[model samples]
Target: GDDDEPGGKGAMYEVTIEQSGDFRSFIKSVVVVANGTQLKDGATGESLASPVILSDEELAVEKVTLSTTGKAIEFAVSGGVVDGEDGVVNEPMQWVVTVYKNGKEIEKKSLVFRDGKEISTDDLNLYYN
Candidate 1:
């Protein structure tokens, strides 16, 4: 048995990537990593730990067949952030997405979030053999 906690380690976010240029196929997996950054509180004007969630584990390649349309990916974002933290708190949430083809790992696109708004364009490129 385990605890039924929703948010304890940090913030679990729904990452969406909309690619619109240079598409590739036969991709095996995609990797997403949250860059280390600072975190703060707006209500009390206090600084919290840096919200850094690193995902080295490659996400399984499936579902979407197109890149022009947006793809939604979800991963457990833990570390730096504290309990009860949400969109209300100010945190630097920047993530990098990489895709793999055959056995080659090519770093592609990256996206960042300011407050609750995304501040990066999804320019993901695809390559296949």
Candidate 2:
């Protein structure tokens, strides 16, 4: 009963999750859970997972034509921005999540963190395509 939401529509769509920073090496993982389920690659049977040790590599999770029913899509990323010596930087880090339907971008959500913490906003709308 918790899996499906009331008045929810099941459709095929593409989801993209990405993390960004000048020093992206501190990015631990980008995990997305849609409809109370972890997302996986549509082409491959493998899961859309991330590594433990962070690196400068780009962190992105792209799932194509994922069919699911839900009132909202949710995601999370585990990471921090403190260096080895506990020295803080003056830059900012961010995480971006986007949903595309019919090859058109519908929803875009972004979270920005500064001084080792995330900045919150008043935008909390989640659209259904």
Candidate 3:
């Protein structure tokens, strides 16, 4: 039976990457970790767990949902490789991460990688709005 709860483990989200550069440009790798408390009545509790994994081998979108709220979302994107002449790397690339809750847009963040650098963010809360 449906409990008709406002928010719970049943809540879901979608993650998308908007990149500005050559399609051949790719991220070295990506890691997303979840840590924090659940913002809901009768929530189980906080649980540090694996959030998501993205690969540079291929570019794609991801859809996910956590069982808790007030979560500390940690994410990192490695430096990217830009397509160049004769399979050579020309320059670095950048990416934008947009999060959606149940198909509704939440927030968008820009991750820039320069000179083979990686960008990361930790303890991003999910209970703000």
Candidate 4:
């Protein structure tokens, strides 16, 4: 039935990459790892993954197509971030995307929504590519 239920086990987000100002090149790859550092038990210091994956790799945005505006990269961020503990409705997962170009760090951004925006880039030093 069409109740207030969550969808089961599908790609969670359509992640879009945009930089501030103007840059030419494209994004090489994006990697998202569930913040396991926050899962310390305060004594044993065991690593606990909220979503239970060794590491999650974001499919790189390839095939550069010329755009009049600044370059933009789109990726389907798969994985059920909030699968357990909070039932099927409560998913307490926060993501961050790190951008790279020519094997150099371009920007590191948190995938957070503020005021109905998916990525807040106020505290980031980036030239949106």
Candidate 5:
């Protein structure tokens, strides 16, 4: 069904559909960083680049939780960066969020979302316990 799109609310694991900016038509597709360390600072003015996927448990796609000051949820994406294109700041890239069971992608969602606000690649820390 069209409503069962992987990018929809319930298709992907640990992620929710969220409106990024108030007036903007775009939305957010988040995923928590379950492993690895903080991303280093950008050599250019772009934000840091970090992995979008994380290996959790034997379960692979474990349900994690995301928390902010108020808007609490599961899943958070690492800060995005521009590929040094036509002199754009933090260019939007099509990042894929894949939920793996074993080694195959069970659920996937690709979205072009720019990481704004005060979050950095170092801030992609997630609490799955």
Candidate 6:
């Protein structure tokens, strides 16, 4: 159970995991973004901030295909802005975790993750049509 860390591969210094970067280079980047969207709490009737990473459904819409090209996955997305006013603040801050690659221009939007879990490729086929 200890070896099964949701964020990392093996949790053993991650030395065993080095295949994704074979073609180009090995790099891991995590960018946290905050969004205005918040979930409504059922028990307290209060709004709750979303998670950091996207769910399987979100990833699919983001076009992160299993047959994706290159050794990286990057997207242009806007989570939340910094140094902004808090007078309109309501719920807690939400975040978005996106990967960075060679860099390219893509569509942009604003949204937060559903579940408070990290990315999981266990269902790669879920990406396909």
lDDT of each: 0.30, 0.43, 0.43, 0.27, 0.31, 0.23
Winning candidate number (TM-score)? 3
The true-versus-predicted C-alpha distance at residue 77 of model 2, in Å, is: 9.8
Clashes found in each candidate (C-alpha, N, C closer than 3 A): 1, 0, 1, 3, 2, 0
Give lDDT tens digits, candidate 4, residues 31-116: 22222112211123353333222222222222111111111232112321212222323212233545443235545555432222
Angstrom error at residue 61, model 6: 16
Q: What number of backbone clashes does candidate 5 have, counting pairs of residues 3 or more apart or in separate chains? A: 2
lDDT of predicted model 3: 0.43
Q: What are the per-residue Cα lDDT tens digits for candidate 3 across 4-101?
A: 33443433443456655443444445444443332221123334334555466545333222333442333222333333334445565566666665
* Candidate no. 3 TM-score: 0.44
Cα deviation of 10 in candidate 3 (Å)? 4.9
Query: How well does model 5 score by local distance difference test?
Result: 0.31
lDDT of 4 at 2: 58
Give the alpha carbon lDDT tens digit for every residue of 3-113 in model 1.
533432322222333322211211122333322223323224354343332222222222111111111122222111111223344434433544432234443555443
Clashing pairs in 1: 24-126
Model 6 root-mean-square deviation = 19.0
Cα TM-score per model: 0.25, 0.41, 0.44, 0.23, 0.23, 0.17
| Winning model by lDDT | 2
lDDT of 6: 0.23
The digit string of per-residue lDDT tens for model 6 on 68-102 reads: 22121222222222222323333332222222223
Error of 5 at 53 (Å): 11
